[PDB]
Write a protein that binds this ligand. Structure first.
Ligand SMILES: COc1ccc2ccc(=O)oc2c1CC=C(C)C
Ligand SMILES: COc1ccc2ccc(=O)oc2c1CC=C(C)C
Ligand SMILES: COc1ccc2ccc(=O)oc2c1CC=C(C)C
Ligand SMILES: COc1ccc2ccc(=O)oc2c1CC=C(C)C
Lengths: 608, 102, 115, 63
């Protein structure tokens, strides 16, 4: 048993001669074991039974410059012993690291020739790794490359290994794994910005894709049920998503697997067709929908700047929602006027007094029904869900107050005033929907209610400290609050200063409160400017790009299907043989670079 | 910047006058008197209204609420247009001034 | 290094690791394990932590005369260890001290003459 | 500063036996005849790429 560990030590070192003679000793052990015929006696002596690690495994852990000689001897030892398939394709037995198959290790240790010999040995190169480490619940715990030796070298930027694994016979590029992912998913899953990662995730996405040659291995969906394009949306990885939409290929026999088809070019002017296979909302899950209806990811302002999203989003405003938002704006504007006039300022022939109150009741319900479902469908109060709360609350209190008049409880009038009060509050809520005027204010209403109230929570507590102090100078306590609030106004004067007890002490506590208020009110004035400059100033139009585009698709589901069927952007076009696609046309002009053109949708440039 | 300050302050004032008349009909419901309620609430911007006019006939607890909500929100809004004019009109209107001067 | 407050040398002390085998003992920031792009490390705590009467962290705190204390605390074995001591002790300790003195001021003003 | 000032100021206020429970880091062996209390921090790098030869352990994950 010491002899086994001495081998593991000889595994751990480059002692070539010491490694050889122990195998000569182990060969003599196999000779003396006649009855076993050494199937597993070879296995038992070369492997710790608790962990499943072998001699070839542990040698690939510890890399020395004598490692290549260790490999060629270990493979020479197994081949007389005829158990190399059992030897090389051994795997881990514990639930962590589960089935690692140290061909995986040599990829991770980046040894190309050592990898080539194991391929030349034949090592089941589509070996699915498992284990809690390879599929971690947390980011700090493990590393999720997607359980594939091919995808590992892809994820670890070793393109020659990606090249060398590419032309094996039983490679099976289309493989799936635990969590249901394909090789492109993990490439999306493991990606960052141009900071901290430089374009290899893009390029290794490209390099494997040219070998593919089929629309499948993008049409596949995971166990979550998502395409790599869909998973690009849900993960929100921006830099890969730019590459997907503008993926064009000049090289002829596989120009089919391409997007952004070049329509025509005539010198500095060209036109192009961006594909709409799954971007537009004609399908239940679309690219544009997932980017809108998620708050948890990040960075939604960046992704919407990208081109086939950006123009298509602009067109849907122009043909639908600029009419739709202005119409919704005018109806609720008439609704608030309809509330306040017939409150008490104004029943047989008086039709328009009665039909006016009827018009209030019918429209407030449909808002309350639609918002009541929508709130029940769903973090939230930071953006737009607190707003959709107030629309529902204001609608109910209109309905609730009139129903108090039916049961004649006297608070029907008082609840009616609160309903009309919040009716103008939601009238302020449409002011963000203009391009400019609400949006610098509304997102800073998020900020100015935060920063001034924390000053006011100081200041009201700063108020009541001085208030009980002067009340001790001889409800009168509530009157002392009202007296000291006049000092903020300036209404208190010299004659009220003529105290009964200690005029010298009463003269001190006044002027200390005056100056410190001038200290504090100047301080929040200064500190708001230095903090909210250029950060809240930019984040304002960020949410303006959000909450507009939020509502645009929210208007889109409100339209009927037959009227949607008229308004379909883009057009059915033929980019290749036996293919017909709806695509979006965008004209543009470049001047800087200059190239002759070989890829054409048409010969004739102009619109026919 | 008279081109600019008439644009940016009036859109605040078109909010604020509409922000005025919403509170104006609310306190008028607390018992032309409607035009007098505008003149009463404009005194609050001046500071002329005081404690004795607060002694309402109906619901003093509700009349105490609608005053102080208008005071703070006015201090919110008038501070907001003060901040937003500085961050927007810096260095762009400041350069475009001498452009038109040329 | 702490008392003089020389920052640039102090970064070299804490992350002083050596790959060269026969003297890898005289090293700090021991590499735990690495698997591709993910690695773990062990920063030593020979004299940094306050288990000894004079420690590195103590001298950086309890001096005003030197300079530049914001720079030195950005350094790594200080920075994480300082963050952990907030989380396991002082966020409970400061909030508890905050609530007692908050109750204390209310306890002062009420029984002044109101009751 | 003043946060981290008070943190160590709270530290001396604690008793020794309760401090003895809360000891950050762990006793580990980095070399022969050496045992040290050290702090573990995980991190991720992408830019440079090197094969690894210096190891505390062969097995990456927490056991
Ligand atoms: C009005 O159309 C919209 C609407 C929303 C967004 C949101 C993000 C964005 O970056 O772009 C957008 C556009 C395009 C604007 C123009 C001037 C072509
Ligand atoms: C165009 O109609 C609109 C417009 C705007 C809104 C705003 C919020 C909302 O929840 O509902 C709305 C509706 C639906 C009302 C009807 C009568 C179908
Ligand atoms: C709350 O933990 C603290 C406390 C104090 C300091 C002081 C200096 C410093 O630069 O870093 C600090 C941290 C670390 C914060 C995080 C979020 C890891
Ligand atoms: C946790 O206890 C606290 C909390 C906060 C402070 C603040 C300043 C101070 O000088 O002393 C303090 C103490 C010690 C009091 C006791 C009863 C042991």
């Amino acid at each position: 048993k010491r002899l086994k560990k001495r081998i593991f030590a000889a595994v751990s070192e480059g002692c070539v001669e010491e490694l050889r003679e122990l195998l000569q000793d182990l060969q003599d052990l196999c000779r003396r074991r006649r009855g076993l015929d050494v199937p597993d006696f070879l296995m038992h002596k070369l492997t710790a039974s608790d962990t499943g690690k072998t001699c070839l495994m542990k040698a690939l852990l510890n890399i020395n410059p004598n490692t290549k000689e260790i490999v060629r001897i270990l493979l020479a030892f197994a081949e007389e012993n005829d158990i190399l398939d059992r030897f090389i394709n051994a795997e881990y037995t514990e639930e962590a690291y589960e089935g690692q198959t140290a061909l995986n290790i040599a990829i991770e240790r980046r040894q190309g020739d050592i990898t080539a010999v194991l391929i030349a040995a034949g090592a089941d190169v589509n070996a699915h790794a498992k284990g809690v480490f390879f599929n971690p619940k947390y980011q700090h715990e493990g590393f999720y490359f997607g359980e594939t030796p091919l995808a590992l070298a892809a994820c670890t930027n070793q393109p020659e290994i990606v090249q060398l694994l590419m032309e094996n016979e039983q490679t099976d590029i289309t493989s799936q794994d635990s969590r249901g992912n394909n090789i492109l998913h993990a490439l999306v899953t493991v990606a960052e910005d141009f900071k901290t990662q430089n374009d290899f995730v893009k390029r290794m996405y490209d390099m494997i894709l040219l070998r593919s040659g089929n629309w499948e291995l993008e049409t596949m969906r995971n166990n979550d049920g998502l395409t790599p394009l869909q998973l690009a949306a849900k993960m929100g990885k921006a830099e890969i998503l730019k590459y997907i939409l503008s993926r064009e290929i000049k090289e002829k026999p596989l120009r089919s697997l391409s997007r952004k088809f070049t329509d025509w070019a005539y010198g500095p002017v060209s036109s192009s067709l961006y594909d709409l296979t799954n971007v537009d909302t004609t399908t239940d899950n679309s690219v544009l929908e997932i980017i809108v209806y998620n708050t948890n990811i990040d960075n939604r302002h960046e992704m919407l700047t990208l081109e086939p999203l950006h123009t298509l989003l602009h067109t849907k405003w122009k043909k639908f929602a600029k009419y739709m938002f202005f119409l919704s704006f005018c109806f609720y504007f008439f609704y608030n006027i309809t509330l306040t006039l017939v409150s008490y300022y104004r029943h047989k022939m008086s039709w328009l007094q009665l039909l006016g109150r009827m018009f209030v009741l019918i429209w407030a319900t449909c808002i309350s029904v639609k918002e009541g479902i929508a709130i029940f469908l769903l973090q939230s109060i930071l953006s737009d869900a607190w707003f959709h709360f107030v629309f529902f609350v204001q609608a109910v209190l209109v309905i609730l107050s009139v129903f108090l008049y039916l049961f004649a409880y006297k608070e029907y009038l008082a609840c009616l005033v609160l309903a009309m009060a919040l009716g103008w509050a939601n009238m302020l809520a449409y002011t963000r929907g203009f391009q400019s005027m609400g949006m610098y204010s509304v997102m800073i209403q998020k900020v100015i209610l935060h920063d001034v109230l924390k000053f006011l929570f100081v200041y009201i507590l700063f108020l009541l400290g001085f208030g009980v102090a002067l009340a001790s100078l001889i409800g009168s306590f509530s009157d002392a609050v009202l007296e000291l609030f006049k000092l903020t106004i300036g209404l208190g004067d010299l004659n009220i200063q003529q105290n009964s007890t200690y005029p010298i002490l009463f003269l001190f506590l006044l002027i200390t409160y005056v100056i410190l208020t001038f200290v504090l009110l100047l301080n929040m004035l200064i500190a708001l400017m230095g903090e909210t400059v250029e950060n809240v100033s930019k984040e304002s139009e960020r949410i303006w790009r959000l909450q507009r585009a939020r509502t645009i698709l929210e208007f889109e589901k409100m339209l009927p299907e037959w009227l949607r069927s008229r308004f379909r952007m883009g057009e059915l076009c033929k980019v290749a043989d036996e293919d017909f696609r709806l695509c979006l046309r965008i004209n543009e002009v470049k001047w800087t670079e200059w190239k002759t053109h070989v890829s054409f949708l048409n010969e004739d440039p102009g619109p026919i």
